């Protein structure tokens, strides 16, 4: 029976000089065991739910500023990088964005003069909504998540209300203002999933591309590297970091876990003690592998940051229970639900450079 994450060798010193490694977090989870891993293995920090646009500004010109200032205040005092997620996202943003002064949906309007007038008055929206967050936390903030998931997964980019509204150009706005209020040693990121899907990632590289023509600051990509244990290939991975490097760009993986599952992820076990050992050896032997790449190309990444601490908190969990009739449960992490390691910990941290 392993010891408990409190009781092993650090991963964060484990890559020093190499990349930071972080974790996304809840303020209630920053007291007892889960803060006390996260002093001993991380050294980089993100807010699951407390920075996105929903929860900073539910409705106009009303803040909510005190989760978020609970993880800036725990990493200000435990010497923690922070990124910032999320400033602009088509998910979890307030629907009073999307709205005209007369009440009415902006997406719906079909007279040509008042399309524009949404489209300045969204932008306005928008660019108070970043200043308003870069101005409060821009000391606190080494990694800001600019723009979330706006290349789609078919081929364009994503046709949500920003962009049936702006068209590309709430993205410039974006990356223009953020870099404004900033300053210019803020780094600006994009974070998108399935970046390792080559069709994704030529779009996504495409639009960098012609953003960074036309002079937007884009200092990086961020890959939320949501992965499987078979699922996608390492070079695949390989193929995606480089291209951006090509560009001259930084990459960050930003939200990685590897679901024991496929996708869709049925039939889900229910129970941790479940869960097979040759499985959880798989999950390990991917991990190395993974983690070989990240330091075959750490030049290109400077930090790479879990979804999570310890398989006891999930979304991974919540999308289990999606597809398997609400039942079922998923141990995404090096860290188990009771915190005690698991096989991939020990993969991740020793010293084996045998090649496979
Ligand atoms: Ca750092
Ligand atoms: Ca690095
Ligand atoms: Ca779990
Ligand atoms: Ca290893
Ligand atoms: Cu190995």
Known sequence: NQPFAWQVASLSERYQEQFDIGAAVEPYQLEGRQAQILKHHYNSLVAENAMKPVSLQPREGEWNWEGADKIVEFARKHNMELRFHTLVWHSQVPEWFFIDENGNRMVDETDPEKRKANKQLLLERME??????????????????????????????????????????????????????????????????????????????????????????????????????????????????????????????????????????????????????????AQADRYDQLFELYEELSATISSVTFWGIADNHTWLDDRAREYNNGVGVDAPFVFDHNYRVKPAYWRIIDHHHHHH
């Open 128 to 281: 108070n909504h970043i200043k308003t967050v870069v101005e409060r936390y821009k000391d606190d903030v080494t990694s800001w998540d600019v723009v979330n998931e706006v290349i789609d997964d078919d081929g364009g980019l994503r046709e949500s209300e920003w962009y049936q509204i702006t068209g590309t150009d709430y993205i410039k706005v974006a990356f223009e203002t953020a870099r404004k209020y900033g300053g210019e040693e803020a780094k600006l990121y994009i974070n998108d999933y399935n970046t390792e899907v080559p069709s994704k990632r030529d779009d996504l590289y495409n639009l960098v591309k012609d953003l960074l023509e036309q002079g937007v600051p884009i200092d990086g990509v961020g890959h939320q590297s949501h992965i499987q244990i078979g699922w996608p290939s390492i070079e695949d991975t390989r193929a995606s970091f480089e291209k951006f490097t090509s560009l001259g760009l930084d990459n960050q993986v930003t939200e990685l876990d590897m679901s024991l599952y496929g996708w869709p992820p049925t039939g889900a076990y229910t129970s941790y003690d479940d869960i097979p050992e040759e499985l959880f050896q």
